Ligand binder design. Structure first.
Ligand SMILES: [Fe+3]
Ligand SMILES: [Fe+3]
Ligand SMILES: [Fe+3]
Ligand SMILES: [Fe+3]
Ligand SMILES: [O-]
Ligand SMILES: [O-]
Lengths: 491, 84, 323, 491, 323, 84
């Protein structure tokens, strides 16, 4: 006979002791634990709501890989990827490059909590968390590797985060901030709660649906499998927030959440936004990126925050408005500067696409449309060179993303500048600037790509220089995904 | 040779524009336009391009030169359409 | 235009089509790209300082740590194939020995020995879990990290066995204190203090190379020889067939951690000065291990012999590495 | 440590003993064992060339199902089957109905050898054989069951072999002859050697390729998985033939092979033939059914027979010629009598289809084309009723398939009639008639569908009567697969 | 026009969405469609006669044998999940007890007992394999057949364990005859003849109901009580820990065959006359079982007791079925 | 009422045709044609349909009736095109 889990579970996480040959602070250094003056005993209240034990883990996850990997081997020799919509191929090439190594990096973050959390529950869950991201990183390398002979862009699944291409900088800027350079409690809040529970879970759901809809079942299976691992470790932040709120730190807890969500949203608005509203074919589109944000992301956050005794962040209304705008900026930025990324951006401004854009976002043609008008005439009128850039946009010093917003008839592009210790910083929103102001020691001597350019760190100090600096050469440098085929619609 | 950040009217994005300390506002405006007009913004030849400091709204005369503007390197500048 | 490649660009000159292990495991850490500024933030952040100090400035040096290769070549997929196998066996043992009333058959004396010498191991095992997971996060290469990753999972594996068997023992003998008494045993029993001091101290050696040595070369063979080899033998000869098999099971994991440990040391020896570096760390920590094996094994029956055997078997592990 | 298989394998099959409390003949009754006067000791020479042991089996086959079933669950909600070519859907509906219950029946056949073989090697292999067909039957029910709400035709995966529809009779006529009603040695020869090794292995390969090519990966995975189980038990016949030849029975061994192959070929020519040359789209076609027969079936048989000390069967040249003909007959029969089967036959005689037919089979339009000409005019000229029958074709008393052959300008349709005990039998070939003559006690009082009709066993004694007798009602009764859409090509 | 259905047409009135077990297992035999002519050939073929005689004319009668349902509800997919689990455990045992030199530790006396009483079981086990596989091919319904199918695989499973352990024993003790001597033991040792006569005779009971009784209700509990229960207990108390665990393992399979056996008997009892039919077959065969348990267990140590225990435990199996 | 098996010229398949014991070969031929002519065989109205016994090739005169033919029930008959 076997015990029922409930009967012996607690003993798995009954592992705290009172050190004696070294001191608590030496065993649990504050910079790594973030115990915040709250006692060991009070951290022992930490109670993960989703429980699992080693034998369950290896059994359940053995089956998950069996599936995922059999699906891939079964579908490999049909090579779906050779005949997929190219906005789809692009979606995939972007995903792998932006995520694979960061997923792997996430295991270190988990390892952070696994050693340094004073909550024994957290330490164990994070060990499983640590295994989870070992998987994600691993599988999200194994999968793209099937395509390395089709194009060098697939090498970026590995290489991207080893480069200074601007998107990779933006990714690392997010991740190192959220999960690599903070204490254990912090990571539990900023990564597992704010980012994984708040964004990347629901994103992965949508991404799997879209993969399916596109006829890519290898990828649909991949993504959906990974997604089933999420809540197991994504849960870790909640209990931490409970302890913090119940013990005199509601504000500190608030501040981390405020920072973690804004930073998540910015990165989300360049990675998911453009894909939803521009790369996925018109007839494959269930809802707008704004619709998806409001349904599956925003309400949940409010629900979570309310149940935890926290408030909506100060910037929440701004964030609402920004759903009409930010990602359209991000997409225009990416498309216009398309030689600077490692996938082919899809324009997504055909007439039919444009009425859809106009429906989901009333005022779009009156604003975003204007820029695209000029892009379009230029392409009709055999002047394609005015659709590629001769300079570098202003980079936000927080999110490391272009500073961009409404154009056209409702022009509202702003820079939330800040002078600090005789250096001028640039910020793409009030919130990005605020993130620096609450903790400047943390960002102060970081330099964005533009700073580097300006300081003589990029040599030759021209565009071709910036291209080598960013490890990009023809063949990975991105161009229009449908090879301009949407232009024929205007002649 | 002086870096500024161009926030061109009706464009979507602020851009890095090298200008010259010797340039007039007019000539700043021209160097900016190059990267916005006919790329993402429609010309307006019944109009005149003016230069204002983005942070505080201060409008520079067409004729003043960069040297005299009180600009911080990398300062953001609004490039707007006017009749005067 | 850049041509498509046969494999990842970093693996491009190899002659041998890379394996799964190579494809998913190699050259993954990015914080080692900018030793001056590991992380995409300000360079004076405490975590910048910590990696600079405890990873980059390690006396244990190599030009290309990314060259390291796990001898067992474990990836996540094959880790769970392996351990699910091994777990079916151990959960099998639990299920079927229960059925048979194995715990009922043990003597009062042996039940006392279990409570003193067996159960409290949950603390020691969880401490190794914390130990190996620290190696993970400060090792200078993804293939070193991965070895530590899986060994951390095994450490949790042992803890879990111990936690489970502790309930079963508490169920069978409710008046012994199983599950309630262990902290006080761990914290206050002379038999444990050898180890508790070894592990508490080792857990604050931040330098990755020193962490690796203190944990994987010094502490682990001592914990394994004492708690698996000596206690298991004893269990078997005392009619505790479950624990004799359990411990032999967990020693499979130990042998694997030793294999990768050995591989790493072999690799460090390519570089002059590293044997001396490793030997110096061993000489600092070996005394504390001696104390651990002494304090623990001596309180066992036939105590002096267990000490002699465990001392030389753990020593043996390092001798074979050339250290 | 573990032993290497080689070291202990023999002990698994060291299981014969000399009975004492009953007699050998009582333990191994000749009608069930077919030991043929050859001693127990001499049967112990039986040495299967592919070896496997219980723990290997359950491990390897656990993984096979994990895959196959995960592929199905992953692809289910996309419902490929709703948008597949209908010649494909038909191919599937025919396959399941003709094969599923017979596969299950094959486990009994295996069980036959497992109890009654005097070769211990055979007894064990047949136990694994028995497990194999338990799988095939099971999985080939689980899979079609996903479609029961799409059409009642899918119920035939279960129901077919419980009916008196003419194809089901033909199937059971083959299978009960080959594997259900013969002694153990016989089954080893006629089923595992002649049928499984000789036909159904290579068929399954082709069927999986075709499934893939059609974009049906659930089915491609299904079929190919089953196929990997084949040689494990398909091998059983060879060793039996060796023993028989080495011991004075070359002729008996010959005769079984001759019977088993012809009977296999006939059934194959109505099940696989039409599908290859008519249901699969023109541009999906790798090779002709005749090409496939010559490459993957015929040469192998000659190779097998030569290595075993046997001869090519007496009818071999006839069989060669018949590759140009038989299946075209079978397909015309099936199509013309399409309300009498449970899938929609695909005509496959569009102009482009017809030049392909003419290339693969010079003389086709001059012969088979003639009939199709008349069918075609009739359909152009709004007389569809002359393309459905008012009578029942002559059924062969061996194969229970229509008696049919060349039409048109090279007319060669023959009946190999036989009067035997005051009853007249009809046979579709020299070989079919010969199968009866060498063993008439085995077929004598069997009645084909036509015999039944003629004897008053089908009531009402009209076509609608024969339809109920065969359990067929509108909704499963078959019609033209592309709903006549290929007619538009002729106006 | 015939409408699409929610499930197979034969399962169409059920209220409960059928399960996997039902969907793949039920109403599959077709030879029972035409009791006058089971097979699509001439009706005087010997195999027509055999099924008519031994399946259709069975005194053990029911209106709807296809109604039978395996309590464990095994299908192929779940059979291999189960047994792969269980096989990891037993192959685990083999691997790890070897490693430890378990065979070396056994006494000369116990090595002699193994050769006499343990090894030759390959013959008895293979005979049950042949026994259950005959039930398969003559049972009147696919769900009955399937139960027999899986039990046949288990019988082969036991044989395979025995074959494997026989090599290991031959390797450890080359002068005992392990693997060479068993046929002569099976054929000539008084301890075996009880069983050999039971099984040889039972193997020629062609009637399916009589086959089921003779094999599954009479012979199997006798073989299982004697060779698994009594020999395993003995093994354990004689320091043979491998075989004590092995046998307890194989008894899991036995308990499962008993479960489905019980289910079938429960089902036959719905029909008047069937208890009397089953009881009569039991009274014919029970004497031969008694002889088997007597001849075998008596030659063991503490012999008279093993006989008493095994006799009533096997009896107990049938009493609980109501027979 | 007598069952025969029609092997119609230039068709691909033998068919069951009920005829009458009283029928003439001509009338056998007609009853056969019904199931072949204009279904899978082209009419030949410069031709005459003859009836021969399939087993041995024996040609029956147009005018003889089934009664007198010596036919076994279910006998196969070739239905061929001729000028006489
Ligand atoms: Fe992840
Ligand atoms: Fe995650
Ligand atoms: Fe099969
Ligand atoms: Fe087969
Ligand atoms: O994750
Ligand atoms: O098969």
């Amino acid at each position: 006979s076997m015990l029922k889990r409930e009967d012996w579970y607690d003993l798995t996480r009954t592992t705290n002791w009172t050190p004696k040959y070294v001191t608590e602070n030496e065993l649990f250094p504050e910079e790594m634990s973030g115990a915040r003056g709250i006692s060991m005993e009070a951290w022992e209240k930490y109670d993960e709501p989703y429980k699992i034990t080693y034998p369950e883990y290896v059994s359940i996850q053995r089956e998950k890989d069996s599936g995922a990997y059999s699906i891939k081997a079964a579908l490999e020799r049909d090579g779906f990827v050779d005949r997929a919509d190219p906005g789809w191929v692009s979606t995939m090439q972007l995903h792998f490059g932006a995520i694979a190594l960061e997923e792997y990096a996430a295991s270190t973050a988990e390892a952070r909590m696994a050693r340094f959390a004073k909550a024994p529950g957290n330490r164990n869950m994070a060990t499983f968390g640590m295994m989870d991201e070992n998987r994600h990183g691993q599988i999200q390398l194994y999968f793209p590797y099937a395509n390395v002979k089709r194009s060098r862009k697939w090498d970026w699944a590995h290489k991207a985060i080893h480069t200074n291409e601007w998107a990779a900088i933006a990714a690392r800027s997010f991740f190192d901030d959220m999960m690599m350079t903070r204490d254990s409690v912090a990571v539990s809040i900023m990564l597992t709660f704010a980012f994984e529970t708040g964004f990347s879970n629901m994103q992965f759901l949508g991404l799997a649906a879209d993969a399916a809809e596109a006829g890519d079942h290898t990828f649909a299976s991949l993504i959906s499998s990974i997604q089933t691992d999420e809540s197991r470790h994504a849960q870790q932040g909640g209990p931490s927030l409970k302890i913090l709120v119940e013990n005199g730190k509601k504000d500190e807890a608030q501040q981390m959440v405020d920072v973690a969500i804004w930073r998540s949203w910015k990165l989300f608005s360049v990675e998911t936004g453009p894909i939803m509203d521009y790369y996925t074919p018109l007839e494959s589109r269930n809802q707008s990126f704004k619709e998806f944000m409001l349904e599956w992301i925003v309400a949940q956050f409010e629900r979570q925050l309310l149940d935890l005794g926290l408030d909506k962040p100060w910037y929440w209304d701004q964030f609402m408005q920004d759903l009409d705008e930010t990602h359209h900026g991000m997409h225009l930025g990416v498309w216009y500067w398309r030689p600077t990324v490692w996938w082919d951006p899809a324009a997504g401004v055909s007439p039919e696409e444009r009425e859809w854009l106009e429906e989901k976002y009333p005022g779009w043609n009156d604003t975003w449309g204007q820029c695209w008008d000029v892009i379009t005439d230029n392409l009709v009128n055999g002047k394609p060179e005015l659709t590629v850039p001769e300079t570098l946009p202003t980079i936000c010093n927080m999110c490391n993303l272009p500073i961009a917003h409404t154009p056209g008839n409702k022009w509202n592009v702003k820079d939330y500048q800040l002078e600090y210790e005789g250096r001028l910083y640039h910020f793409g929103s009030e919130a990005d600037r605020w993130c620096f102001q609450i903790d400047p020691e943390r960002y102060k001597n970081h330099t964005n790509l533009v700073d580097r350019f300006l300081k003589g760190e990029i040599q030759p100090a021209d565009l071709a220089g910036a291209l080598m600096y960013m490890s990009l050469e023809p063949g990975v440098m991105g161009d229009d995904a449908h090879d301009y085929e949407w232009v024929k619609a205007y002649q | 040779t002086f870096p500024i950040m161009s926030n061109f009217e009706r464009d979507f994005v602020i851009q890095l524009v090298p200008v010259d300390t010797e340039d007039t506002m007019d000539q700043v405006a021209e160097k900016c336009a190059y990267h916005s007009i006919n790329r993402r913004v429609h010309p307006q030849p019944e109009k005149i391009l003016r230069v204002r400091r983005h942070e505080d709204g201060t409008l520079f005369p067409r004729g003043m030169i960069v040297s005299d503007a009180g600009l911080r390197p990398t300062e953001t500048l609004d490039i707007i359409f006017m009749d005067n | 235009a850049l041509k498509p490649l046969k494999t990842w660009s970093h693996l491009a000159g190899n002659r041998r089509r890379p394996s799964e292990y190579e494809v998913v495991s190699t050259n993954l850490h990015y914080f080692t790209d900018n030793p001056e500024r590991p992380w995409e933030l300000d360079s004076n952040l405490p975590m910048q300082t910590w990696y600079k100090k405890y990873c980059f400035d390690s006396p244990l040096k190599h030009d290309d740590w990314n060259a390291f290769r796990d001898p067992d070549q474990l990836v996540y997929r094959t880790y769970n194939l392996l351990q699910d196998g091994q777990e079916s066996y151990v959960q099998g043992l639990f299920d079927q020995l229960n059925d048979r009333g194995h715990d009922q058959m043990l003597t009062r004396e042996w039940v006392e020995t279990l409570a003193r010498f067996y159960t409290p191991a949950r603390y020691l095992f969880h401490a190794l879990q914390m130990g190996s997971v620290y190696i993970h996060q400060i090792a200078p290469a993804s293939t070193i990290t991965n070895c530590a990753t899986y060994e951390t999972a095994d450490h949790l594996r042992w803890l879990t066995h111990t936690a489970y068997r502790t309930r079963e023992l508490a169920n069978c003998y409710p008046d012994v204190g199983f599950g309630k008494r262990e902290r006080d045993v761990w914290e206050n029993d002379p038999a444990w203090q050898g180890f508790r001091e070894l592990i508490e101290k080792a857990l604050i050696a931040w330098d990755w190379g020193e962490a690796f040595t203190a944990i994987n070369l010094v502490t682990k063979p001592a914990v394994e020889e004492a708690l698996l080899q000596q206690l298991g033998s004893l269990a078997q000869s005392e009619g505790d067939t479950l624990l004799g098999l359990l411990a032999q099971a967990q020693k499979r994991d130990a042998e694997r951690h030793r294999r990768w440990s050995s591989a790493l040391v072999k690799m460090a020896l390519e570089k002059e000065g590293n044997r001396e570096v490793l030997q110096k760390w061993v000489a600092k920590w070996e005394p504390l291990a001696d104390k651990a094996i002494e304090a623990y094994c001596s309180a066992l029956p036939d105590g002096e012999n267990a000490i002699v055997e465990a001392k030389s078997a753990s020593r043996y592990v390092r001798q074979m590495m050339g250290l």
